[PDB]
Amino acid sequence: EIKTISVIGATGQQGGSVARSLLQNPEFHVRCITRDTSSIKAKELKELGIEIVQADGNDPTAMATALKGSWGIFINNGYTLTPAVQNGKYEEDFGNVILQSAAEAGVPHVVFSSQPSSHALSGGKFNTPVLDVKAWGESWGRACPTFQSFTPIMASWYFQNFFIPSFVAEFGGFPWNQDDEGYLTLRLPPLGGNEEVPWICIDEDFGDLVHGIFLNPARWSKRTVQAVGDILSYGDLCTTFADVTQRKARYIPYYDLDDMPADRPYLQESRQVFAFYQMRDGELFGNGITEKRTASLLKAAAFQAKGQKGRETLITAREWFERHC
Amino acid sequence: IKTISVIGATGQQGGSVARSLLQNPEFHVRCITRDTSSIKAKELKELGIEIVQADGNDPTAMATALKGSWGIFINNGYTLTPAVQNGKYEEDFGNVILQSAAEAGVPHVVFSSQPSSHALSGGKFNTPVLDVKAWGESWGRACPTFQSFTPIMASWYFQNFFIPSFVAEFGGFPWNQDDEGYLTLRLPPLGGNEEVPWICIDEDFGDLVHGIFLNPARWSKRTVQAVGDILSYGDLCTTFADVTQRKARYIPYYDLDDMPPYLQESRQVFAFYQMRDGELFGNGITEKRTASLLKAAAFQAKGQKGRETLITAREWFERHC
Amino acid sequence: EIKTISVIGATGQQGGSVARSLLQNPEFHVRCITRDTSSIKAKELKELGIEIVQADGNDPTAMATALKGSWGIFINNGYTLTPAVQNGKYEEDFGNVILQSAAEAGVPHVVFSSQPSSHALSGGKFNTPVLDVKAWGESWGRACPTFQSFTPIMASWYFQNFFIPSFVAEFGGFPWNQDDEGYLTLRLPPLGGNEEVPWICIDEDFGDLVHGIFLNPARWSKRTVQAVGDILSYGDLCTTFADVTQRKARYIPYYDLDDMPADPYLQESRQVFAFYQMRDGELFGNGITEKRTASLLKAAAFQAKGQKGRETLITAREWFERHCRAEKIERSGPIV
Amino acid sequence: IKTISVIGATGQQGGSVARSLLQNPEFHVRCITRDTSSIKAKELKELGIEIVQADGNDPTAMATALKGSWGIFINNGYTLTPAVQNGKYEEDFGNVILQSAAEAGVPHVVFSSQPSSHALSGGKFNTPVLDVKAWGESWGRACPTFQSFTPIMASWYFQNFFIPSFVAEFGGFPWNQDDEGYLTLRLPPLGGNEEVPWICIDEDFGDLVHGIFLNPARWSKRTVQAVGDILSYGDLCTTFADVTQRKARYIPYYDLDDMPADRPYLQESRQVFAFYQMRDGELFGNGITEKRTASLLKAAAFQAKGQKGRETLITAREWFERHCRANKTSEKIERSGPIVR
Numbered sequence A: 001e002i003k004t005i006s007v008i009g010a011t012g013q014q015g016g017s018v019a020r021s022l023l024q025n026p027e028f029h030v031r032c033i034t035r036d037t038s039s040i041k042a043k044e045l046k047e048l049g050i051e052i053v054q055a056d057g058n059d060p061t062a063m064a065t066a067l068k069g070s071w072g073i074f075i076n077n078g079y080t081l082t083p084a085v086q087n088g089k090y091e092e093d094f095g096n097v098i099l100q101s102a103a104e105a106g107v108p109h110v111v112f113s114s115q116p117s118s119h120a121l122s123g124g125k126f127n128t129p130v131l132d133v134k135a136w137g138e139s140w141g142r143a144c145p146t147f148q149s150f151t152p153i154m155a156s157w158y159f160q161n162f163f164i165p166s167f168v169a170e171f172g173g174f175p176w177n178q179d180d181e182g183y184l185t186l187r188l189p190p191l192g193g194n195e196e197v198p199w200i201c202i203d204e205d206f207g208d209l210v211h212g213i214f215l216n217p218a219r220w221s222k223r224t225v226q227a228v229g230d231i232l233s234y235g236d237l238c239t240t241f242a243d244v245t246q247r248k249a250r251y252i253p254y255y256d257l258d259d260m261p262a263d264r265p266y267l268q269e270s271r272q273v274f275a276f277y278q279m280r281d282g283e284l285f286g287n288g289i290t291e292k293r294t295a296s297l298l299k300a301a302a303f304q305a306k307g308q309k310g311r312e313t314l315i316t317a318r319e320w321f322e323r324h325c
Numbered sequence B: 001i002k003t004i005s006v007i008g009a010t011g012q013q014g015g016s017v018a019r020s021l022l023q024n025p026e027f028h029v030r031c032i033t034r035d036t037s038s039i040k041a042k043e044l045k046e047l048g049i050e051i052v053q054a055d056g057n058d059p060t061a062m063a064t065a066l067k068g069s070w071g072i073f074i075n076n077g078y079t080l081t082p083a084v085q086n087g088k089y090e091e092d093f094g095n096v097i098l099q100s101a102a103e104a105g106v107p108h109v110v111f112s113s114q115p116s117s118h119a120l121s122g123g124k125f126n127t128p129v130l131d132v133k134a135w136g137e138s139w140g141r142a143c144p145t146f147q148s149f150t151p152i153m154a155s156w157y158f159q160n161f162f163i164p165s166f167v168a169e170f171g172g173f174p175w176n177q178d179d180e181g182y183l184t185l186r187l188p189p190l191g192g193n194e195e196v197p198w199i200c201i202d203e204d205f206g207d208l209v210h211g212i213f214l215n216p217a218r219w220s221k222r223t224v225q226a227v228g229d230i231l232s233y234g235d236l237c238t239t240f241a242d243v244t245q246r247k248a249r250y251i252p253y254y255d256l257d258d259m260p261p262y263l264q265e266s267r268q269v270f271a272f273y274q275m276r277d278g279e280l281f282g283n284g285i286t287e288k289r290t291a292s293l294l295k296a297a298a299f300q301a302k303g304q305k306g307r308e309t310l311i312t313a314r315e316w317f318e319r320h321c
Numbered sequence C: 001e002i003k004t005i006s007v008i009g010a011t012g013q014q015g016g017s018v019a020r021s022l023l024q025n026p027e028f029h030v031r032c033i034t035r036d037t038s039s040i041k042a043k044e045l046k047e048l049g050i051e052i053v054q055a056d057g058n059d060p061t062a063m064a065t066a067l068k069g070s071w072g073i074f075i076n077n078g079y080t081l082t083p084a085v086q087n088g089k090y091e092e093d094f095g096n097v098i099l100q101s102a103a104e105a106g107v108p109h110v111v112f113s114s115q116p117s118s119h120a121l122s123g124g125k126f127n128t129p130v131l132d133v134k135a136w137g138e139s140w141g142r143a144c145p146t147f148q149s150f151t152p153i154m155a156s157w158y159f160q161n162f163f164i165p166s167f168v169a170e171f172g173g174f175p176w177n178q179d180d181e182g183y184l185t186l187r188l189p190p191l192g193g194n195e196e197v198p199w200i201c202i203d204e205d206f207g208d209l210v211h212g213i214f215l216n217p218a219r220w221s222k223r224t225v226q227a228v229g230d231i232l233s234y235g236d237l238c239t240t241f242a243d244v245t246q247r248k249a250r251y252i253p254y255y256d257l258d259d260m261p262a263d264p265y266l267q268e269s270r271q272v273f274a275f276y277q278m279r280d281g282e283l284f285g286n287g288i289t290e291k292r293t294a295s296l297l298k299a300a301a302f303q304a305k306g307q308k309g310r311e312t313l314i315t316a317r318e319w320f321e322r323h324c325r326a327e328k329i330e331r332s333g334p335i336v
Numbered sequence D: 001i002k003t004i005s006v007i008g009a010t011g012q013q014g015g016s017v018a019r020s021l022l023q024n025p026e027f028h029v030r031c032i033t034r035d036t037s038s039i040k041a042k043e044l045k046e047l048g049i050e051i052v053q054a055d056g057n058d059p060t061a062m063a064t065a066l067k068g069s070w071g072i073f074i075n076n077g078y079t080l081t082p083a084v085q086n087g088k089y090e091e092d093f094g095n096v097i098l099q100s101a102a103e104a105g106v107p108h109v110v111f112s113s114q115p116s117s118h119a120l121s122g123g124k125f126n127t128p129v130l131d132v133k134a135w136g137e138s139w140g141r142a143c144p145t146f147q148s149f150t151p152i153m154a155s156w157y158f159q160n161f162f163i164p165s166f167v168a169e170f171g172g173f174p175w176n177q178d179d180e181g182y183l184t185l186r187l188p189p190l191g192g193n194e195e196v197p198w199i200c201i202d203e204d205f206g207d208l209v210h211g212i213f214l215n216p217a218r219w220s221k222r223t224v225q226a227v228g229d230i231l232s233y234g235d236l237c238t239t240f241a242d243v244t245q246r247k248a249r250y251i252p253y254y255d256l257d258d259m260p261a262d263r264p265y266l267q268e269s270r271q272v273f274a275f276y277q278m279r280d281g282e283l284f285g286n287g288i289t290e291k292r293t294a295s296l297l298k299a300a301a302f303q304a305k306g307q308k309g310r311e312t313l314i315t316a317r318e319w320f321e322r323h324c325r326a327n328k329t330s331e332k333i334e335r336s337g338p339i340v341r
């Protein structure tokens, strides 16, 4: 009756949302995995009544032993890549190691946080390890005969990125620090195409999307899921923020990738991601058109499966600004 | 063989209507103008179009010039008389023509229209440029003589980018670079999700009216939105930048009270649009599906002549910038 | 501060949903209007704690006095038209009389249950009083200079038509009586165009749309609102029913309107169907059929009620899941 | 001038590809066939297209017959060898050709593909008609030599109405009248919202392959759904009825066990439809069914061809108005397709 689901990164944003969503369904038993059960965040997960296991993804045997009995697993990696991984050893990423360990432990159903490979799609003329490592994990999971289901889920930009101070530093004053001309100014290169920039409130929605996948894993196997709460251009984001907060805001694109300030190291290292996205006419996920219909179908299903508990629709940018500003 | 009188055939809207209808042998175009010796009048003559001289302000003359018309397209001008400006919308030459068409027994009417901000805002707003046409719309909707009366509502013309005064007031976009090197567009937000409608008046509007005349009964009393593309002002600028590789940006006029130097009294229109959450047409959501259908229908009625699809903002920039 | 709203037909389906929706917002006070406060349905409302006033729409003066003090009014009419109304004299329908009474009483904000006029749209070819009676009221209210806001709202096919017996008899066994070959068969003419048939759960959704309008009446003045919960073809409706209930169902079109059973109200429905086909299925007459606006209004009411109820409209799949997998066929409707 | 080899150029898919690309001076169409003396091979020759003779089952000859190609469009046939029917998907002549194209150094590939029901369902389904093409898709996606590899996935052809086995097996629609005077279509539901995709293979498909070749890098490793219209089976029949004024209807096989499964291809189609219903109608497996991209690849080819032809895809209504309203005797029901009985 009861299906156990191991949650990687349960102390983190993606896995944290996953754990919080799945625990609200009696058909599932959540086994959070963390490196330190004494962690501040781990104790918060232990206050929700969640089973907590301590293990390190870089230890395949220990990980395999910690996933022994899981019906499903949600896998993700971290913001910091090891030098070996940053230099093209994508098989050494702890997320990818965990996926292989799950194969050995016999876990039948996998939901894997993934990203497109700029290298694979551009014929080798681009290399963006931050994305390509997760894409490697997706290539391994899709080809593995052991799994009964492997579904890649691709996260959008978090709305919560607006709370990172260097975010405010890098991309113009937007959305907290106004400039000399009195504007909350956002400065980013265009995405390309029709400027269909995807955004999500990671906390409230991502976990419910993964939950919806686990409600019927066979239907979603080997079919990429885009975790998208809203789709709008940078300029529409600014006008929406201004309407909500009644604070002047504007968008000034970085049309020339070479003419971005070297003062900003998050613009210079992202210049290959931005170029790959532009080359793809803004189709940043690589599998097909950017659409949030599936996400709105995976959120409603989790809503029903949870007992009509919580919210039935994903958080839009307008609502996030109304709730956070 | 159905005869159609075309008001404003020397103008943008009526000109597109005449040029589109002429390519369907089932329809015979009778252009109406005040001056048949005009350059534009002669251009219409060079295409082999019948040109009759009449003034909309003369109901008696106009009734005589419409006799025998199966249908009529009606439009007015940018110029309102002081009397019309001050509320006597029955005197606008377009609405006079509509009443004359009723007198002459013309059975099928397509009327260039706009919503009445005054009527929709409970009196808060007064915009004669729109409300005058709305007067004709209600009159035609209530008139029992017509067999069909269909209102058509034009979006912003792309060709407004060629009006020097438009370039003057709304920033430099898309011709005049500013100090920081940007083609800058300065406009109040439309409201809602910034679904700003635009049309290439020359190539598409006439085809939409043509499509209406292909089945007047199905469109009677149903407003048609003449929309070629739907996008936000910022999308306009990013599209322009991609097409031309000329830096461009959008800086909204957030406060209609603190606008600059730039005496365009279109403020009440902008405020009414915002009050409608951007639903500038007033009848329902902004949609171009109907326009696309009508354009394709004209394409096929004309013999697969011309374009089957409406001109988008990107294509307009490609062809004119 | 607290805005009073009179609800016509509060004992009925449309007004009942309106009352039940506006009751959950303390900014509004619901004054139900009924002819008989002793009714089973009226006492149901009294048991819910709703003010009940007795008045008859056919009495303009009494109606005016009973509407006095209302900030807003929801107006609707009934399924049975007097013969005089049947033959024109649309001004005499109690809904339209009530609209004029509200104008006399000075009610500033109006939401009116409406439908397109086939006669006005067809150049006289068609005459369907079931629609045209409400269209008369719609134009009268649109032209009325006294109202501060006037919004016409138009109902789609109720899902609850499946509980109305007259629906079950004529339009095939669907969805309760299986037919000779074991099929739940629906027998109806095509709508026209791409078969974009609108449906709504009248009980749970219609009232929330009226509520959403009253939340910002100025923005909706003179703007037709389509009360649409789902848009799907008749065949898609039947296949969805089959998927939900694992019970055979099918759609049998009347391709020839002359071959449709027309044994007085079936004659008015033949003309209505012909008008819809003549409009390529654009049965509302003002523009394309769309449920986007309905969704916006439903969400707005959801928020206003304190995030109570559902944020989304009920689809055909949801309705079949809730009312067929598990329902007495005795609801109010056309008396054929 | 960039040369593109076209597999199956004498067939429906490759034929549309050749006819579309030839009208664009930036490309050279090199048709590939087993028999250059064929009556359909001579039609292509009458169009002014190079015709080379090679067999896909001969990897070396195929390699020498592709060398010099800037791009290649790859497709397979309706008949699979017994070895291929039984799993040996590497032996399908289309997949051998794909390996030959890498072998030959063709830098840009457009591969006719379908999802693998087995791969997506954890082994619950085995439908070689789709999975064979999916094998080639996986190989092309993983091959490091190609500069671009784009899978394109065909919908139901409207031209299935000209394939005789379709008319026989699936109730007779739209040509064979039944007891009650109905053109009856008999098919299981697709699943989900009955978003059945259809395309006019002749007029539209080639333009989509062409649009991909207009910017291969932007489409590399991105599945393209070749869709002209999206509608339910019942909507298909009612649309046909409106166009032709002939009674027509759709009678679903709600229970797949009640579908005629006399012959082996009908049972493999039962398993395919079961897979579709399993995926809630997502018959392509990569994502939602959509025709926006197809409408973007048709318009782009329209422009590339010199604004010649149609800018838009053919809808079901327009196809019925073009092929089933007039008698049009030249439209005979003899097209290549599944040979069931």
Ligand SMILES: NC(=O)c1ccc[n+]([C@@H]2O[C@H](COP(=O)([O-])OP(=O)(O)OC[C@H]3O[C@@H](n4cnc5c(N)ncnc54)[C@H](OP(=O)(O)O)[C@@H]3O)[C@@H](O)[C@H]2O)c1
Residues within 6 Å of the ligand: A008, A009, A010, A011, A012, A013, A014, A015, A033, A034, A035, A036, A055, A056, A057, A058, A076, A077, A078, A079, A094, A130, A134, A155, A156, A157, A158, A161
């Ligand atoms: N913020 C963004 O920009 C953004 C948006 C889009 C997508 N992404 C992508 O998603 C990833 C970051 O996701 P996130 O923000 O959820 O990360 P996060 O908040 O740091 O969570 C990742 C979790 O990984 C666990 N972990 C780290 N090293 C580990 C190891 N060696 N073994 C086992 N577990 C380990 C940590 O929890 P324990 O202490 O429990 O082990 C940590 O909480 C990156 O690839 C990023 O590019 C993020």
Ligand SMILES: NC(=O)c1ccc[n+]([C@@H]2O[C@H](COP(=O)([O-])OP(=O)(O)OC[C@H]3O[C@@H](n4cnc5c(N)ncnc54)[C@H](OP(=O)(O)O)[C@@H]3O)[C@@H](O)[C@H]2O)c1
Residues within 6 Å of the ligand: B007, B008, B009, B010, B011, B012, B013, B014, B032, B033, B034, B035, B038, B054, B055, B056, B057, B075, B076, B077, B078, B093, B112, B129, B154, B155, B156, B157, B160
């Ligand atoms: N982008 C836009 O500005 C836009 C969009 C929405 C709607 N509109 C509205 O549509 C109108 C402008 O349309 P348009 O571009 O066709 O105007 P236009 O280019 O100025 O043409 C007006 C036409 O009316 C004719 N006319 C003028 N006075 C007349 C009279 N007294 N009797 C008879 N005919 C007369 C003119 O010359 P002849 O009489 O010599 O033929 C001409 O053919 C305005 O009301 C405007 O507000 C335009």
Ligand SMILES: NC(=O)c1ccc[n+]([C@@H]2O[C@H](COP(=O)([O-])OP(=O)(O)OC[C@H]3O[C@@H](n4cnc5c(N)ncnc54)[C@H](OP(=O)(O)O)[C@@H]3O)[C@@H](O)[C@H]2O)c1
Residues within 6 Å of the ligand: C008, C009, C010, C011, C012, C013, C014, C015, C034, C035, C036, C039, C055, C056, C057, C058, C076, C077, C078, C079, C094, C113, C130, C131, C154, C155, C156, C157, C158, C161, C332, C333
């Ligand atoms: N699915 C549909 O059939 C549908 C959808 C579109 C529009 N419509 C139209 O809407 C109308 C039916 O709506 P409904 O479902 O609400 O009808 P209903 O269930 O009969 O309710 C009508 C309401 O009006 C009240 N009423 C009836 N006669 C009255 C009178 N003379 N004076 C005052 N109040 C009176 C009734 O209350 P008491 O009984 O106590 O008065 C009742 O609450 C018809 O014109 C129909 O064509 C319905």
Ligand SMILES: NC(=O)c1ccc[n+]([C@@H]2O[C@H](COP(=O)([O-])OP(=O)(O)OC[C@H]3O[C@@H](n4cnc5c(N)ncnc54)[C@H](OP(=O)(O)O)[C@@H]3O)[C@@H](O)[C@H]2O)c1
Residues within 6 Å of the ligand: D007, D008, D009, D010, D011, D012, D013, D014, D032, D033, D034, D035, D038, D054, D055, D056, D057, D075, D076, D077, D078, D093, D112, D129, D130, D153, D154, D155, D156, D157, D160, D336, D337
């Ligand atoms: N509606 C549909 O039926 C549909 C939908 C989606 C996709 N598909 C799939 O696509 C395939 C059908 O495509 P189609 O209509 O283009 O096929 P087709 O009409 O059968 O054409 C086959 C082509 O391939 C060539 N060929 C066949 N066997 C060969 C071999 N052993 N070696 C070399 N060449 C060989 C033929 O050579 P010659 O040049 O000598 O004739 C011919 O040009 C099937 O797998 C089908 O399942 C079709």
Ligand SMILES: CC1(C)c2[nH]c3ccccc3c2C[C@@]23CN4CCC[C@]4(C[C@H]12)C(=O)N3
Residues within 6 Å of the ligand: B114, B129, B130, B154, B155, B156, B157, B160, B163, B165, B166, B264, B266, B269, B280
């Ligand atoms: C009258 C107006 C405010 C206006 N002022 C202008 C000043 C300069 C250039 C261009 C315009 C336009 C263009 C428009 C475009 N239209 C959109 C629907 C109705 C409306 C409003 C709008 C119109 O009448 N013409």
Ligand SMILES: CC1(C)c2[nH]c3ccccc3c2C[C@@]23CN4CCC[C@]4(C[C@H]12)C(=O)N3
Residues within 6 Å of the ligand: C115, C130, C131, C155, C156, C157, C158, C161, C164, C166, C167, C269, C272, C273, C283, C333, C334, C336
């Ligand atoms: C008059 C009608 C044909 C009708 N005949 C019926 C006869 C018996 C049962 C049920 C109905 C209904 C249902 C409807 C629902 N419709 C939604 C759009 C307006 C309209 C028309 C439509 C209506 O007013 N009642």
Ligand SMILES: CC1(C)c2[nH]c3ccccc3c2C[C@@]23CN4CCC[C@]4(C[C@H]12)C(=O)N3
Residues within 6 Å of the ligand: D114, D129, D130, D154, D155, D156, D157, D160, D163, D165, D166, D169, D265, D268, D269, D272, D273, D283, D337, D338, D340
């Ligand atoms: C293999 C199949 C079940 C099939 N069986 C048939 C048997 C006889 C006639 C005609 C067909 C077709 C036509 C199709 C149409 N296509 C839609 C998407 C892929 C698919 C599935 C589908 C295909 O491969 N050809």
